[PDB]
Swiss-Prot record, chain A:
Keywords associated with the record: Amino-acid biosynthesis, Cytoplasm, Diaminopimelate biosynthesis, Lyase, Lysine biosynthesis, Schiff base
Class of enzymatic activity (EC top level): lyase
Protein name: 4-hydroxy-tetrahydrodipicolinate synthase
NCBIfam families, sorted: dapA
UniProt entry tagged with the keyword Transmembrane helix: no
Protein's organism: Staphylococcus aureus (strain COL)
Active site: 134, 162
Swiss-Prot record, chain B:
Swiss-Prot/TrEMBL site (Part of a proton relay during catalysis) positions: 46, 109
UniProt record, GO biological process: diaminopimelate biosynthetic process; lysine biosynthetic process via diaminopimelate
Catalytic activity line of the entry: L-aspartate 4-semialdehyde + pyruvate = (2S,4S)-4-hydroxy-2,3,4,5-tetrahydrodipicolinate + H2O + H(+)
Protein's name in the database: 4-hydroxy-tetrahydrodipicolinate synthase
Entry's family note: Belongs to the DapA family.
Pfam families assigned to the protein according to its UniProt record, in alphabetical order: DHDPS (PF00701)
Entry annotated with the keyword Magnesium: no
Database matches in CDD domains: DHDPS
Reported regulation of activity: Is not feedback inhibited by lysine.
Quaternary context: Homodimer.
Keyword field contains ATP-binding: no
Alphabetized SUPFAM superfamilies for the sequence: Aldolase (SSF51569)
Annotated source species: Staphylococcus aureus (strain COL)
Amino acid sequence: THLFEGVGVALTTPFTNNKVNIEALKTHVNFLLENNAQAIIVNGTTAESPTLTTDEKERILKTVIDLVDKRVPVIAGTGTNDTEKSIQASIQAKALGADAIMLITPYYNKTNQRGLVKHFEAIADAVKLPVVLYNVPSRTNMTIEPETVEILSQHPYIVALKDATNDFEYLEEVKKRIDTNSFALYSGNDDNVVEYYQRGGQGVISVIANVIPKEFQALYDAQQSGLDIQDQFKPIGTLLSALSVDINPIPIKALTSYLGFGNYELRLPLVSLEDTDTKVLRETYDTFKA
Amino acid sequence: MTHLFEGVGVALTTPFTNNKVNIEALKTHVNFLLENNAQAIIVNGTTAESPTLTTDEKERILKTVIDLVDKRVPVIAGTGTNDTEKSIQASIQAKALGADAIMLITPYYNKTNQRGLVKHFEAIADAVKLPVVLYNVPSRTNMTIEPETVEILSQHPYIVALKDATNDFEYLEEVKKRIDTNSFALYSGNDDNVVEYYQRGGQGVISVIANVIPKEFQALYDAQQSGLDIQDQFKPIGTLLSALSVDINPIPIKALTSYLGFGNYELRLPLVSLEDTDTKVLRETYDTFKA
Protein backbone atom coordinates (compact mmCIF):
# COMPACT_ATOMS: atom_id res chain seq x y z
CA THR A 1 0.00 0.00 0.00
CA HIS A 2 2.77 2.64 0.67
CA LEU A 3 4.89 3.46 -2.39
CA PHE A 4 7.82 1.77 -0.62
CA GLU A 5 9.23 1.08 2.84
CA GLY A 6 12.90 1.31 3.74
CA VAL A 7 15.47 3.23 1.76
CA GLY A 8 14.66 5.37 -1.24
CA VAL A 9 17.61 7.14 -2.86
CA ALA A 10 17.70 10.85 -3.68
CA LEU A 11 19.66 10.16 -6.89
CA THR A 12 22.52 12.52 -7.79
CA THR A 13 22.96 13.81 -11.35
CA PRO A 14 26.15 12.52 -12.99
CA PHE A 15 27.85 15.35 -14.96
CA THR A 16 30.65 15.05 -17.39
CA ASN A 17 32.14 18.36 -18.53
CA ASN A 18 28.82 19.90 -17.38
CA LYS A 19 26.73 17.53 -19.45
CA VAL A 20 24.34 14.93 -18.07
CA ASN A 21 26.05 11.61 -18.58
CA ILE A 22 23.31 9.11 -19.45
CA GLU A 23 25.56 6.07 -19.42
CA ALA A 24 26.80 6.88 -15.90
CA LEU A 25 23.23 7.60 -14.93
CA LYS A 26 22.24 4.06 -15.98
CA THR A 27 25.22 2.46 -14.21
CA HIS A 28 24.36 4.30 -11.02
CA VAL A 29 20.68 3.31 -11.11
CA ASN A 30 21.62 -0.34 -11.84
CA PHE A 31 24.05 -0.24 -8.92
CA LEU A 32 21.24 1.12 -6.74
CA LEU A 33 18.73 -1.57 -7.82
CA GLU A 34 21.27 -4.40 -7.47
CA ASN A 35 22.03 -3.16 -3.99
CA ASN A 36 18.49 -3.18 -2.72
CA ALA A 37 17.36 0.39 -3.07
CA GLN A 38 13.58 0.40 -2.42
CA ALA A 39 12.74 3.47 -4.57
CA ILE A 40 14.52 6.09 -6.72
CA ILE A 41 13.67 9.75 -6.11
CA VAL A 42 14.68 11.57 -9.36
CA ASN A 43 15.44 15.33 -9.74
CA GLY A 44 15.34 16.06 -5.99
CA THR A 45 17.56 18.54 -4.19
CA THR A 46 20.35 15.98 -4.17
CA ALA A 47 20.07 15.92 -8.01
CA GLU A 48 20.72 19.68 -8.21
CA SER A 49 17.24 20.13 -9.76
CA PRO A 50 17.42 23.94 -9.38
CA THR A 51 20.29 24.07 -11.99
CA LEU A 52 18.90 21.41 -14.34
CA THR A 53 17.18 22.55 -17.48
CA THR A 54 13.71 21.17 -18.12
CA ASP A 55 15.03 19.07 -21.06
CA GLU A 56 17.69 17.62 -18.73
CA LYS A 57 15.15 16.74 -16.04
CA GLU A 58 12.97 15.00 -18.67
CA ARG A 59 15.85 13.07 -20.30
CA ILE A 60 17.04 11.93 -16.89
CA LEU A 61 13.59 11.05 -15.66
CA LYS A 62 12.68 9.05 -18.81
CA THR A 63 15.99 7.21 -18.63
CA VAL A 64 15.44 6.23 -14.99
CA ILE A 65 11.86 5.14 -15.70
CA ASP A 66 12.74 3.01 -18.76
CA LEU A 67 15.73 1.44 -17.07
CA VAL A 68 13.98 0.66 -13.73
CA ASP A 69 11.12 -0.91 -15.74
CA LYS A 70 8.73 -1.01 -12.73
CA ARG A 71 11.11 -2.99 -10.49
CA VAL A 72 10.85 -0.22 -7.86
CA PRO A 73 8.86 3.07 -7.75
CA VAL A 74 10.23 6.04 -9.65
CA ILE A 75 9.31 9.24 -7.81
CA ALA A 76 9.86 12.43 -9.81
CA GLY A 77 10.69 15.70 -7.99
CA THR A 78 8.45 18.17 -9.85
CA GLY A 79 7.39 20.80 -7.30
CA THR A 80 8.77 24.33 -7.21
CA ASN A 81 7.67 27.61 -5.62
CA ASP A 82 5.38 28.23 -8.61
CA THR A 83 2.07 26.21 -8.55
CA GLU A 84 1.39 26.44 -12.26
CA LYS A 85 4.84 25.22 -13.30
CA SER A 86 4.71 22.51 -10.63
CA ILE A 87 1.42 21.35 -12.23
CA GLN A 88 2.94 21.35 -15.72
CA ALA A 89 6.07 19.53 -14.58
CA SER A 90 4.00 16.95 -12.60
CA ILE A 91 1.83 16.28 -15.64
CA GLN A 92 4.92 15.66 -17.80
CA ALA A 93 6.29 13.28 -15.13
CA LYS A 94 3.03 11.38 -15.15
CA ALA A 95 3.06 11.14 -18.96
CA LEU A 96 6.70 9.91 -18.93
CA GLY A 97 5.62 7.13 -16.57
CA ALA A 98 6.60 8.24 -13.04
CA ASP A 99 4.88 6.29 -10.26
CA ALA A 100 4.65 9.33 -8.03
CA ILE A 101 5.77 12.90 -7.72
CA MET A 102 7.55 14.71 -4.90
CA LEU A 103 6.50 18.27 -4.01
CA ILE A 104 8.54 20.51 -1.75
CA THR A 105 6.83 23.41 0.06
CA PRO A 106 7.33 26.81 -1.61
CA TYR A 107 10.54 28.62 -0.71
CA TYR A 108 11.82 32.15 -1.25
CA ASN A 109 8.29 33.49 -1.81
CA LYS A 110 6.96 31.05 0.81
CA THR A 111 3.27 31.03 1.65
CA ASN A 112 0.85 30.73 4.59
CA GLN A 113 -0.65 27.37 5.65
CA ARG A 114 -3.91 28.05 3.80
CA GLY A 115 -1.92 28.84 0.63
CA LEU A 116 0.15 25.72 1.20
CA VAL A 117 -2.96 23.53 1.11
CA LYS A 118 -4.25 25.31 -2.00
CA HIS A 119 -0.90 24.78 -3.68
CA PHE A 120 -0.48 21.10 -2.85
CA GLU A 121 -4.16 20.31 -3.51
CA ALA A 122 -4.13 22.10 -6.87
CA ILE A 123 -1.16 19.97 -7.99
CA ALA A 124 -2.60 16.70 -6.65
CA ASP A 125 -6.00 17.33 -8.31
CA ALA A 126 -4.38 18.23 -11.59
CA VAL A 127 -1.96 15.24 -11.76
CA LYS A 128 -4.00 12.46 -10.11
CA LEU A 129 -0.90 10.55 -9.17
CA PRO A 130 0.52 9.59 -5.73
CA VAL A 131 2.20 12.64 -4.16
CA VAL A 132 4.99 12.74 -1.58
CA LEU A 133 5.10 16.00 0.37
CA TYR A 134 8.58 17.30 1.18
CA ASN A 135 9.20 19.49 4.20
CA VAL A 136 12.70 20.83 4.77
CA PRO A 137 12.64 24.07 6.79
CA SER A 138 16.47 24.50 6.80
CA ARG A 139 16.13 25.12 3.06
CA THR A 140 12.68 26.73 2.84
CA ASN A 141 12.30 28.62 6.16
CA MET A 142 8.71 27.42 6.25
CA THR A 143 7.04 24.22 7.39
CA ILE A 144 3.98 22.07 6.81
CA GLU A 145 2.37 22.39 10.20
CA PRO A 146 1.07 19.14 11.77
CA GLU A 147 -2.59 20.30 11.29
CA THR A 148 -1.72 21.06 7.70
CA VAL A 149 -0.35 17.55 7.17
CA GLU A 150 -3.63 16.25 8.51
CA ILE A 151 -5.68 18.21 6.00
CA LEU A 152 -3.37 17.15 3.16
CA SER A 153 -3.14 13.49 4.15
CA GLN A 154 -6.89 13.25 3.53
CA HIS A 155 -6.28 13.91 -0.12
CA PRO A 156 -6.68 10.55 -1.89
CA TYR A 157 -3.54 11.31 -3.96
CA ILE A 158 -1.32 12.71 -1.23
CA VAL A 159 0.20 9.63 0.32
CA ALA A 160 3.40 10.54 2.17
CA LEU A 161 5.66 13.10 3.73
CA LYS A 162 9.40 13.39 3.30
CA ASP A 163 10.09 14.89 6.73
CA ALA A 164 13.44 16.68 6.96
CA THR A 165 12.60 18.76 10.04
CA ASN A 166 14.79 16.55 12.28
CA ASP A 167 12.22 17.39 15.01
CA PHE A 168 10.79 14.44 16.91
CA GLU A 169 8.25 16.58 18.72
CA TYR A 170 6.98 17.43 15.24
CA LEU A 171 7.13 13.73 14.25
CA GLU A 172 4.89 12.84 17.23
CA GLU A 173 2.39 15.61 16.46
CA VAL A 174 2.09 14.38 12.89
CA LYS A 175 1.78 10.73 13.92
CA LYS A 176 -1.31 11.35 15.95
CA ARG A 177 -3.10 13.16 13.13
CA ILE A 178 -2.54 10.68 10.28
CA ASP A 179 -3.25 6.96 9.73
CA THR A 180 0.13 5.32 8.80
CA ASN A 181 -1.71 2.53 7.05
CA SER A 182 -2.45 4.93 4.24
CA PHE A 183 0.03 7.83 4.89
CA ALA A 184 3.80 7.05 5.06
CA LEU A 185 6.41 9.09 7.02
CA TYR A 186 9.91 9.09 5.44
CA SER A 187 12.88 10.73 7.12
CA GLY A 188 14.64 13.22 4.92
CA ASN A 189 17.74 13.24 7.15
CA ASP A 190 20.12 10.24 7.03
CA ASP A 191 21.42 10.68 10.52
CA ASN A 192 18.19 10.55 12.41
CA VAL A 193 17.15 7.14 11.04
CA VAL A 194 17.84 5.13 14.22
CA GLU A 195 15.35 7.18 16.17
CA TYR A 196 13.13 7.80 13.13
CA TYR A 197 12.66 4.04 12.73
CA GLN A 198 12.17 3.47 16.49
CA ARG A 199 9.31 5.99 16.43
CA GLY A 200 7.57 4.17 13.57
CA GLY A 201 8.80 5.81 10.34
CA GLN A 202 8.29 3.96 7.03
CA GLY A 203 11.79 4.49 5.78
CA VAL A 204 14.01 7.30 4.50
CA ILE A 205 14.72 9.25 1.35
CA SER A 206 18.50 9.09 1.52
CA VAL A 207 21.53 11.02 0.34
CA ILE A 208 24.23 8.53 1.59
CA ALA A 209 22.37 5.58 -0.09
CA ASN A 210 23.70 7.00 -3.35
CA VAL A 211 26.92 5.17 -2.34
CA ILE A 212 26.02 2.69 0.37
CA PRO A 213 22.49 1.51 -0.60
CA LYS A 214 23.04 -2.05 0.61
CA GLU A 215 24.29 -1.21 4.11
CA PHE A 216 21.72 1.56 4.62
CA GLN A 217 18.76 -0.67 3.56
CA ALA A 218 20.18 -3.56 5.61
CA LEU A 219 20.04 -1.26 8.64
CA TYR A 220 16.32 -0.60 8.04
CA ASP A 221 15.71 -4.36 7.55
CA ALA A 222 17.48 -5.19 10.85
CA GLN A 223 15.35 -2.64 12.77
CA GLN A 224 12.20 -4.00 11.14
CA SER A 225 13.07 -7.58 12.11
CA GLY A 226 13.27 -6.61 15.75
CA LEU A 227 17.02 -5.96 16.13
CA ASP A 228 18.73 -3.01 17.79
CA ILE A 229 20.54 -0.75 15.31
CA GLN A 230 21.78 2.00 17.69
CA ASP A 231 25.33 0.66 17.73
CA GLN A 232 25.28 -0.92 14.27
CA PHE A 233 24.58 2.58 12.92
CA LYS A 234 27.79 4.16 14.23
CA PRO A 235 30.15 3.33 11.36
CA ILE A 236 27.58 4.88 9.04
CA GLY A 237 27.21 7.89 11.36
CA THR A 238 31.00 8.29 11.20
CA LEU A 239 30.73 8.56 7.40
CA LEU A 240 27.66 10.82 7.78
CA SER A 241 29.74 13.18 9.95
CA ALA A 242 32.38 13.51 7.23
CA LEU A 243 29.57 14.14 4.73
CA SER A 244 28.47 17.18 6.76
CA VAL A 245 31.61 19.12 5.73
CA ASP A 246 29.42 21.12 3.31
CA ILE A 247 25.89 21.59 2.00
CA ASN A 248 24.40 18.62 0.10
CA PRO A 249 25.01 17.57 -2.64
CA ILE A 250 28.49 19.18 -2.57
CA PRO A 251 29.98 16.36 -0.47
CA ILE A 252 28.02 13.30 -1.71
CA LYS A 253 29.17 13.95 -5.30
CA ALA A 254 32.81 13.60 -4.18
CA LEU A 255 31.73 9.99 -3.41
CA THR A 256 29.44 9.27 -6.37
CA SER A 257 32.23 10.41 -8.77
CA TYR A 258 34.71 8.31 -6.81
CA LEU A 259 32.59 5.25 -7.59
CA GLY A 260 32.58 6.19 -11.29
CA PHE A 261 29.20 7.95 -11.57
CA GLY A 262 30.17 11.07 -13.60
CA ASN A 263 33.01 13.51 -12.85
CA TYR A 264 33.27 15.40 -9.55
CA GLU A 265 31.35 18.45 -10.85
CA LEU A 266 28.74 20.75 -9.31
CA ARG A 267 26.79 23.31 -11.25
CA LEU A 268 27.01 26.93 -10.08
CA PRO A 269 26.05 28.35 -7.59
CA LEU A 270 27.31 25.11 -5.99
CA VAL A 271 31.04 24.29 -6.11
CA SER A 272 32.95 21.08 -5.46
CA LEU A 273 34.88 20.62 -2.18
CA GLU A 274 38.51 21.64 -2.36
CA ASP A 275 41.09 18.86 -2.92
CA THR A 276 41.93 18.34 0.74
CA ASP A 277 38.29 17.95 1.79
CA THR A 278 37.60 15.71 -1.21
CA LYS A 279 40.42 13.29 -0.36
CA VAL A 280 39.47 13.33 3.35
CA LEU A 281 35.92 12.40 2.51
CA ARG A 282 36.91 9.70 0.05
CA GLU A 283 39.34 8.24 2.68
CA THR A 284 36.51 8.15 5.24
CA TYR A 285 34.45 6.23 2.71
CA ASP A 286 37.25 3.68 2.07
CA THR A 287 37.57 3.25 5.81
CA PHE A 288 33.84 2.60 6.08
CA LYS A 289 34.10 0.01 3.30
CA ALA A 290 37.27 -1.70 4.71
CA MET B 1 28.64 61.33 -6.61
CA THR B 2 28.25 57.80 -8.02
CA HIS B 3 25.48 55.69 -6.39
CA LEU B 4 22.57 54.71 -8.64
CA PHE B 5 20.15 56.52 -6.28
CA GLU B 6 19.68 57.55 -2.66
CA GLY B 7 16.48 57.52 -0.70
CA VAL B 8 13.53 55.32 -1.42
CA GLY B 9 13.55 52.82 -4.26
CA VAL B 10 10.27 50.97 -4.77
CA ALA B 11 10.03 47.16 -5.08
CA LEU B 12 7.18 47.36 -7.57
CA THR B 13 4.26 45.01 -7.32
CA THR B 14 2.89 43.25 -10.40
CA PRO B 15 -0.68 44.37 -11.19
CA PHE B 16 -2.95 41.44 -12.10
CA THR B 17 -6.41 41.49 -13.62
CA ASN B 18 -7.82 38.02 -14.28
CA ASN B 19 -4.32 36.71 -13.75
CA LYS B 20 -2.97 38.70 -16.67
CA VAL B 21 -0.44 41.48 -16.12
CA ASN B 22 -2.36 44.76 -16.49
CA ILE B 23 -0.05 46.92 -18.71
CA GLU B 24 -2.14 50.06 -18.31
CA ALA B 25 -2.39 49.70 -14.50
CA LEU B 26 1.40 49.10 -14.52
CA LYS B 27 2.12 52.28 -16.44
CA THR B 28 -0.22 54.19 -14.17
CA HIS B 29 1.45 52.83 -11.07
CA VAL B 30 4.96 53.70 -12.34
CA ASN B 31 3.83 57.27 -13.21
CA PHE B 32 2.26 57.63 -9.77
CA LEU B 33 5.53 56.47 -8.20
CA LEU B 34 7.69 58.87 -10.26
CA GLU B 35 5.31 61.71 -9.66
CA ASN B 36 5.59 61.10 -5.91
CA ASN B 37 9.39 61.27 -5.76
CA ALA B 38 10.38 57.58 -5.93
CA GLN B 39 14.13 57.50 -6.52
CA ALA B 40 14.39 54.13 -8.26
CA ILE B 41 12.12 51.37 -9.53
CA ILE B 42 13.08 47.82 -8.68
CA VAL B 43 11.31 45.58 -11.21
CA ASN B 44 10.50 41.88 -10.81
CA GLY B 45 11.71 41.56 -7.22
CA THR B 46 10.16 39.43 -4.45
CA THR B 47 7.38 41.98 -4.07
CA ALA B 48 6.57 41.63 -7.80
CA GLU B 49 5.92 38.02 -7.09
CA SER B 50 8.72 37.07 -9.54
CA PRO B 51 8.75 33.32 -8.65
CA THR B 52 5.36 33.05 -10.38
CA LEU B 53 5.89 35.26 -13.46
CA THR B 54 6.61 33.68 -16.86
CA THR B 55 9.88 34.76 -18.52
CA ASP B 56 7.65 36.52 -21.06
CA GLU B 57 5.75 38.46 -18.45
CA LYS B 58 8.91 39.62 -16.75
CA GLU B 59 10.33 40.87 -20.07
CA ARG B 60 7.11 42.63 -21.09
CA ILE B 61 6.86 44.31 -17.69
CA LEU B 62 10.56 45.31 -17.62
CA LYS B 63 10.45 46.79 -21.11
CA THR B 64 7.25 48.63 -20.15
CA VAL B 65 8.76 50.26 -17.04
CA ILE B 66 12.01 51.02 -18.92
CA ASP B 67 10.29 52.85 -21.83
CA LEU B 68 7.86 54.73 -19.58
CA VAL B 69 10.48 55.80 -16.99
CA ASP B 70 12.54 57.05 -19.94
CA LYS B 71 15.75 57.26 -17.81
CA ARG B 72 14.14 59.61 -15.19
CA VAL B 73 15.28 57.31 -12.39
CA PRO B 74 17.20 54.01 -12.45
CA VAL B 75 15.23 50.93 -13.49
CA ILE B 76 16.68 48.08 -11.50
CA ALA B 77 15.82 44.67 -12.89
CA GLY B 78 15.60 41.69 -10.50
CA THR B 79 17.13 38.90 -12.60
CA GLY B 80 18.85 36.64 -10.03
CA THR B 81 17.79 33.13 -9.19
CA ASN B 82 19.37 30.04 -7.60
CA ASP B 83 20.63 28.95 -11.08
CA THR B 84 23.73 30.97 -12.15
CA GLU B 85 23.35 30.19 -15.89
CA LYS B 86 19.68 31.32 -15.86
CA SER B 87 20.66 34.43 -13.82
CA ILE B 88 23.28 35.26 -16.40
CA GLN B 89 20.85 34.84 -19.30
CA ALA B 90 18.04 36.86 -17.68
CA SER B 91 20.55 39.63 -16.76
CA ILE B 92 21.86 39.84 -20.33
CA GLN B 93 18.29 40.16 -21.55
CA ALA B 94 17.60 42.90 -18.94
CA LYS B 95 20.67 44.81 -20.15
CA ALA B 96 19.43 44.45 -23.79
CA LEU B 97 16.04 45.83 -22.75
CA GLY B 98 17.71 48.94 -21.23
CA ALA B 99 17.82 48.26 -17.52
CA ASP B 100 20.16 50.58 -15.58
CA ALA B 101 21.13 47.91 -13.04
CA ILE B 102 20.31 44.32 -12.04
CA MET B 103 19.46 42.99 -8.56
CA LEU B 104 20.77 39.55 -7.58
CA ILE B 105 19.48 37.65 -4.64
CA THR B 106 21.68 34.93 -3.02
CA PRO B 107 20.80 31.38 -4.02
CA TYR B 108 18.03 29.82 -1.97
CA TYR B 109 16.74 26.26 -1.62
CA ASN B 110 20.01 24.84 -3.00
CA LYS B 111 21.97 27.55 -1.11
CA THR B 112 25.81 27.57 -1.47
CA ASN B 113 28.91 28.16 0.62
CA GLN B 114 30.61 31.63 0.66
CA ARG B 115 33.14 30.52 -1.95
CA GLY B 116 30.52 29.44 -4.50
CA LEU B 117 28.52 32.54 -3.61
CA VAL B 118 31.40 34.72 -4.77
CA LYS B 119 31.68 32.62 -8.04
CA HIS B 120 27.96 32.99 -8.62
CA PHE B 121 27.81 36.78 -8.24
CA GLU B 122 31.09 37.34 -10.05
CA ALA B 123 30.09 35.22 -13.02
CA ILE B 124 26.85 37.13 -13.37
CA ALA B 125 28.58 40.54 -13.00
CA ASP B 126 31.30 39.48 -15.43
CA ALA B 127 28.73 38.28 -18.00
CA VAL B 128 26.39 41.30 -17.91
CA LYS B 129 28.76 44.23 -17.28
CA LEU B 130 26.01 46.33 -15.76
CA PRO B 131 25.75 47.70 -12.20
CA VAL B 132 24.73 45.02 -9.68
CA VAL B 133 22.78 45.30 -6.41
CA LEU B 134 23.33 42.20 -4.28
CA TYR B 135 20.35 41.21 -2.23
CA ASN B 136 20.63 39.47 1.09
CA VAL B 137 17.42 38.18 2.77
CA PRO B 138 18.18 35.36 5.19
CA SER B 139 14.49 34.98 6.30
CA ARG B 140 13.75 33.78 2.71
CA THR B 141 17.02 32.08 1.73
CA ASN B 142 18.38 30.73 4.99
CA MET B 143 21.86 31.88 3.94
CA THR B 144 23.73 35.13 4.07
CA ILE B 145 26.48 37.22 2.47
CA GLU B 146 29.11 37.36 5.23
CA PRO B 147 30.59 40.77 5.93
CA GLU B 148 33.95 39.49 4.57
CA THR B 149 32.18 38.17 1.47
CA VAL B 150 30.55 41.60 0.87
CA GLU B 151 34.05 43.05 1.16
CA ILE B 152 35.31 40.75 -1.63
CA LEU B 153 32.32 41.36 -3.90
CA SER B 154 32.52 45.17 -3.43
CA GLN B 155 35.92 45.02 -5.19
CA HIS B 156 34.26 44.00 -8.46
CA PRO B 157 33.91 47.15 -10.61
CA TYR B 158 30.31 46.23 -11.43
CA ILE B 159 29.05 45.22 -7.96
CA VAL B 160 27.96 48.46 -6.36
CA ALA B 161 25.31 48.10 -3.65
CA LEU B 162 23.64 45.71 -1.26
CA LYS B 163 20.00 45.54 -0.40
CA ASP B 164 20.37 44.39 3.16
CA ALA B 165 17.25 42.70 4.50
CA THR B 166 19.01 41.05 7.48
CA ASN B 167 17.52 43.51 10.02
CA ASP B 168 20.74 42.90 11.94
CA PHE B 169 22.60 46.00 13.09
CA GLU B 170 25.65 44.10 14.25
CA TYR B 171 25.82 42.87 10.65
CA LEU B 172 25.40 46.46 9.29
CA GLU B 173 28.30 47.64 11.44
CA GLU B 174 30.46 44.65 10.44
CA VAL B 175 29.78 45.44 6.75
CA LYS B 176 30.40 49.20 7.24
CA LYS B 177 33.74 48.21 8.75
CA ARG B 178 34.69 46.46 5.47
CA ILE B 179 33.17 48.62 2.72
CA ASP B 180 33.41 52.29 1.72
CA THR B 181 29.84 53.67 1.68
CA ASN B 182 30.80 56.45 -0.74
CA SER B 183 31.38 53.83 -3.42
CA PHE B 184 29.37 50.87 -2.22
CA ALA B 185 25.75 51.63 -1.32
CA LEU B 186 23.84 50.12 1.55
CA TYR B 187 20.02 50.04 1.18
CA SER B 188 17.72 48.65 3.83
CA GLY B 189 15.52 45.88 2.48
CA ASN B 190 13.28 46.23 5.57
CA ASP B 191 10.85 49.21 5.80
CA ASP B 192 10.49 49.06 9.51
CA ASN B 193 14.19 49.53 10.41
CA VAL B 194 14.75 52.76 8.37
CA VAL B 195 15.01 55.25 11.26
CA GLU B 196 17.97 53.33 12.62
CA TYR B 197 19.27 52.31 9.16
CA TYR B 198 19.50 55.96 7.99
CA GLN B 199 20.88 57.01 11.31
CA ARG B 200 23.63 54.42 10.92
CA GLY B 201 24.71 55.84 7.53
CA GLY B 202 22.59 53.81 5.06
CA GLN B 203 22.12 55.13 1.49
CA GLY B 204 18.34 54.51 1.37
CA VAL B 205 15.80 51.67 1.31
CA ILE B 206 14.35 49.36 -1.34
CA SER B 207 10.79 49.57 -0.15
CA VAL B 208 7.58 47.58 0.01
CA ILE B 209 5.26 50.20 1.55
CA ALA B 210 6.49 52.90 -0.90
CA ASN B 211 4.32 51.08 -3.51
CA VAL B 212 1.50 52.98 -1.86
CA ILE B 213 3.17 55.83 0.12
CA PRO B 214 6.17 56.83 -2.03
CA LYS B 215 5.82 60.56 -1.15
CA GLU B 216 5.66 60.21 2.62
CA PHE B 217 8.30 57.51 2.69
CA GLN B 218 10.75 59.54 0.57
CA ALA B 219 9.98 62.65 2.72
CA LEU B 220 11.02 60.73 5.84
CA TYR B 221 14.42 59.99 4.28
CA ASP B 222 14.71 63.67 3.20
CA ALA B 223 13.76 64.93 6.64
CA GLN B 224 16.58 63.02 8.28
CA GLN B 225 19.13 64.08 5.58
CA SER B 226 18.31 67.67 6.33
CA GLY B 227 19.23 67.10 10.01
CA LEU B 228 15.78 66.48 11.50
CA ASP B 229 14.98 63.59 13.92
CA ILE B 230 12.50 61.15 12.41
CA GLN B 231 12.22 58.70 15.28
CA ASP B 232 8.81 60.08 16.32
CA GLN B 233 7.78 61.15 12.83
CA PHE B 234 8.15 57.50 11.68
CA LYS B 235 5.57 56.09 14.17
CA PRO B 236 2.46 56.79 12.03
CA ILE B 237 4.23 54.85 9.24
CA GLY B 238 5.23 52.12 11.71
CA THR B 239 1.55 51.81 12.57
CA LEU B 240 0.79 51.14 8.91
CA LEU B 241 3.71 48.71 8.85
CA SER B 242 2.32 46.76 11.80
CA ALA B 243 -0.89 46.25 9.84
CA LEU B 244 1.14 45.12 6.78
CA SER B 245 2.92 42.40 8.78
CA VAL B 246 -0.39 40.47 8.97
CA ASP B 247 1.03 38.17 6.32
CA ILE B 248 4.01 37.35 4.12
CA ASN B 249 4.85 40.06 1.58
CA PRO B 250 3.47 40.83 -1.01
CA ILE B 251 0.19 39.30 0.18
CA PRO B 252 -0.73 42.41 2.24
CA ILE B 253 0.79 45.20 0.08
CA LYS B 254 -1.33 43.99 -2.89
CA ALA B 255 -4.48 44.60 -0.83
CA LEU B 256 -3.39 48.27 -0.96
CA THR B 257 -2.04 48.55 -4.55
CA SER B 258 -5.42 47.29 -5.79
CA TYR B 259 -7.18 49.67 -3.43
CA LEU B 260 -5.46 52.50 -5.26
CA GLY B 261 -6.56 50.98 -8.58
CA PHE B 262 -3.24 49.35 -9.58
CA GLY B 263 -4.70 46.07 -10.76
CA ASN B 264 -7.13 43.79 -8.93
CA TYR B 265 -6.46 42.18 -5.57
CA GLU B 266 -4.94 38.98 -6.99
CA LEU B 267 -1.94 36.85 -5.99
CA ARG B 268 -0.65 33.88 -7.95
CA LEU B 269 -0.59 30.53 -6.09
CA PRO B 270 1.22 29.53 -3.87
CA LEU B 271 0.31 32.98 -2.49
CA VAL B 272 -3.33 33.80 -1.68
CA SER B 273 -4.99 37.11 -0.80
CA LEU B 274 -5.87 38.12 2.70
CA GLU B 275 -9.48 37.20 3.47
CA ASP B 276 -12.02 40.05 3.18
CA THR B 277 -11.91 41.53 6.68
CA ASP B 278 -8.12 41.60 7.01
CA THR B 279 -8.24 43.25 3.59
CA LYS B 280 -10.57 45.95 4.96
CA VAL B 281 -8.78 46.40 8.29
CA LEU B 282 -5.58 46.96 6.26
CA ARG B 283 -7.23 49.40 3.81
CA GLU B 284 -8.66 51.48 6.71
CA THR B 285 -5.31 51.54 8.44
CA TYR B 286 -3.96 53.07 5.26
CA ASP B 287 -6.81 55.67 5.01
CA THR B 288 -6.22 56.61 8.64
CA PHE B 289 -2.59 57.12 7.78
CA LYS B 290 -3.51 59.22 4.73
CA ALA B 291 -6.12 61.18 6.75
